């Protein structure tokens with residue numbers, strides 16, 4: 001059986017509030033579903049049917065029937081431009097995320113963000129067929145043609161109206177190395193349970 005990503009512990013659905021810019025940095029983390037005062041635990045995945053070096057990304061996605069990129073940003077260690085990028089392996093294939101925050105996007109900046117996020121996803125091959133638009137399906141970086149840009153602007157416009165800023169999901173995607181060592185072999189992604197803003 002082929003290599004696949006496994007969720008071992010989900011994020012907890014309720015009880016963690018989305019943070020604002022003004023709270024600054026944080027050493028704390030979105031809790032795992034099984035977390036307790038006395039034994040804190042965190043979202044945790046495992047790469048399976050493969051041992052060796054790997055890349056794991058976390059993206060923030062929506063809780064709609066057609067799952068898309070969310071406008072909020074993952075922040076914390078190993079977070080850039082709303083994506084958390086870590087390594088796995090070469091022996092231990094289990095990866096945890098103990099420093100995840102979900103940063104409120106500026107409403108008014110939802111569109112600009114999405115467009116900003118959709119582009120990067122398409123450039124990097126981070127699930128654009130699935131998460132941006134069906135016809136952007138040519139995943140895998142990438143120099144953007146004019147027709148790609150227009151689907152993106154159109155998608156972003158459309159999906160900005162749809163955006164629910166009170167709920168997100170994590171999407172985990174693992175990458176294995178090609179012959180050159182570049183992490184190119186993308187395994188099918190896995191979506192987490194919904195996370196709802198506490199607002200407290």
Ligand SMILES: *C(=N)N1CC[C@H](NS(=O)(=O)Cc2ccc(Cl)cc2Br)C1
Nearest residue numbers: 017018019020021022023024199200
């Ligand atoms: C940033 N300057 N903020 C001011 C209000 C928020 N503060 S907080 O630390 O995020 C928690 C808080 C505190 C008081 C009130 Cl009334 C609401 C909230 Br969410 C962000």
